[PDB]
Design an enzyme around this catalytic site. Structure first.
Site, PDB file in Angstrom:
ATOM      1  N   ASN A   1       1.255  17.790  33.375  1.00 49.55           N
ATOM      2  CA  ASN A   1       2.322  18.563  32.695  1.00 49.55           C
ATOM      3  C   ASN A   1       3.713  17.940  32.908  1.00 49.55           C
ATOM      4  O   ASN A   1       4.728  18.625  33.019  1.00 49.55           O
ATOM      5  CB  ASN A   1       2.332  20.065  33.114  1.00 49.55           C
ATOM      6  CG  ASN A   1       2.911  20.978  32.018  1.00 49.55           C
ATOM      7  OD1 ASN A   1       2.669  20.771  30.786  1.00 49.55           O
ATOM      8  ND2 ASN A   1       3.550  22.036  32.454  1.00 49.55           N
TER       9      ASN A   1
ATOM     10  N   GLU B   1      -0.930  14.002  29.825  1.00 45.90           N
ATOM     11  CA  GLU B   1       0.360  14.601  29.508  1.00 45.90           C
ATOM     12  C   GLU B   1       1.430  14.108  30.483  1.00 45.90           C
ATOM     13  O   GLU B   1       2.100  14.853  31.191  1.00 45.90           O
ATOM     14  CB  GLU B   1       0.348  16.135  29.430  1.00 45.90           C
ATOM     15  CG  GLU B   1       1.583  16.599  28.637  1.00 45.90           C
ATOM     16  CD  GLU B   1       1.716  18.049  28.494  1.00 45.90           C
ATOM     17  OE1 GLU B   1       1.125  18.814  29.276  1.00 45.90           O
ATOM     18  OE2 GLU B   1       2.513  18.465  27.630  1.00 45.90           O
TER      19      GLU B   1
ATOM     20  N   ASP C   1      -8.293  16.659  29.264  1.00 42.00           N
ATOM     21  CA  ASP C   1      -7.935  18.028  28.916  1.00 42.00           C
ATOM     22  C   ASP C   1      -8.391  18.250  27.504  1.00 42.00           C
ATOM     23  O   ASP C   1      -7.775  17.723  26.560  1.00 42.00           O
ATOM     24  CB  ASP C   1      -6.435  18.173  29.088  1.00 42.00           C
ATOM     25  CG  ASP C   1      -5.897  19.484  28.656  1.00 42.00           C
ATOM     26  OD1 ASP C   1      -6.653  20.393  28.281  1.00 42.00           O
ATOM     27  OD2 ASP C   1      -4.638  19.625  28.692  1.00 42.00           O
TER      28      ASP C   1
ATOM     29  N   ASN D   1      -8.483  21.161  26.107  1.00 42.51           N
ATOM     30  CA  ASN D   1      -7.701  22.262  25.524  1.00 42.51           C
ATOM     31  C   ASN D   1      -8.572  23.319  24.851  1.00 42.51           C
ATOM     32  O   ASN D   1      -8.075  24.088  24.015  1.00 42.51           O
ATOM     33  CB  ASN D   1      -6.599  21.744  24.562  1.00 42.51           C
ATOM     34  CG  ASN D   1      -5.262  21.611  25.252  1.00 42.51           C
ATOM     35  OD1 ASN D   1      -4.808  22.553  25.900  1.00 42.51           O
ATOM     36  ND2 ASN D   1      -4.668  20.417  25.200  1.00 42.51           N
TER      37      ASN D   1
HETATM   38 MG   LIG Z   1       1.118  20.861  29.435  1.00 40.10          MG
END
Ligand SMILES: [Mg+2]
Length: 258
Positions: A12, A38, A151, A153
């Site tokens: 993140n 990310e 990820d 998602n």
């Molecule tokens: Mg994020």
């Protein structure tokens, strides 16, 4: 290289995560491969602390958009092939996909799109999933051993999030997204965590909403998949909820060859 201990983490934002333990995780040398998603790194401008890590090779891809997406892979061994992107411009330009081949397997490190912002981004996410499945299937057809981390998602099944009946209209838990995961695994891939652990309460993402992570109101969004031909090589598969610093925690697995 008989053994590989791999960890994968959506950080993140890599610059921020470098101050909150990511460097500790890397410099400990515990993992043979460390994949990050990310990064939010613009124009290949990596944090200085990441640039010249010692005892690791590192490879990064940036999105065209600054402060967005981006993935990187660190490994103790030098890859025999490096490819940034699947070779489709509309996906490669978002810096979501990094391939590194090793002697024993192909590694795909992926930050799959989040579909929540708009219908158009949900469309993009589903189109990315289709392109990825075709890409992986072509490699698998050739006899590659595939490890895919990152990820996704999406929480695959009701057991993969704490509040499934509150989230069926939310990208992350839409029937069509879950159906795509069914189609992916049915093409001959394994969800490594589920090779060993059938239990719920096992998540890799929590809202920053106060107390959500402490109360384990989570989703399992992060996975490591293997092609079926790697089944007997997978010795463990983990989630690391004790590792702080992002809204996601890491996931990982261990491989053994020869
Ligand atoms: Mg994020």
């Amino acid at each position: 290289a008989e053994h590989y201990n791999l960890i994968s983490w959506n950080v993140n934002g890599l610059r921020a995560a470098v101050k909150k333990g990511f460097l500790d995780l890397l410099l400990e040398h515990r993992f043979d491969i460390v994949c990050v998603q990310e990064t939010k790194v613009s124009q290949d401008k990596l944090p200085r602390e990441v640039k010249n890590i010692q005892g690791y090779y590192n490879y990064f891809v940036s999105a065209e958009q600054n402060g967005y997406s981006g993935v990187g892979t660190f490994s103790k061994n030098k890859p025999i092939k490096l490819e940034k992107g699947m070779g489709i411009e509309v996906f490669d330009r978002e810096g979501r996909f990094l391939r590194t081949d090793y002697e024993d397997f192909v590694l795909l490190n992926i930050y799959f799109p989040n579909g929540k912002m708009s219908q158009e981004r949900l469309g993009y996410k589903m189109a990315f999933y289709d392109a990825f499945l075709d890409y992986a299937n072509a490699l698998k057809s050739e006899g590659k051993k595939l490890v895919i981390c990152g990820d996704v998602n999406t929480a695959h099944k009701e057991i993969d999030l704490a509040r499934p009946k509150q989230n069926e209209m939310i990208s992350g838990f839409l029937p069509e997204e879950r159906a795509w995961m069914d189609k992916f695994l049915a093409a001959g891939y394994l969800d490594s965590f589920r090779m060993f652990n059938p239990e719920g309460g096992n998540y890799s993402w929590w809202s920053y909403r106060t107390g959500a992570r402490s109360r384990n109101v989570g989703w399992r969004l992060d996975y490591v998949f293997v092609s079926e031909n790697l089944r007997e090589n997978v010795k463990s598969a983990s989630i690391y909820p004790e590792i702080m610093g992002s809204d996601h925690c890491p996931v990982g697995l261990e491989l053994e060859f020869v």
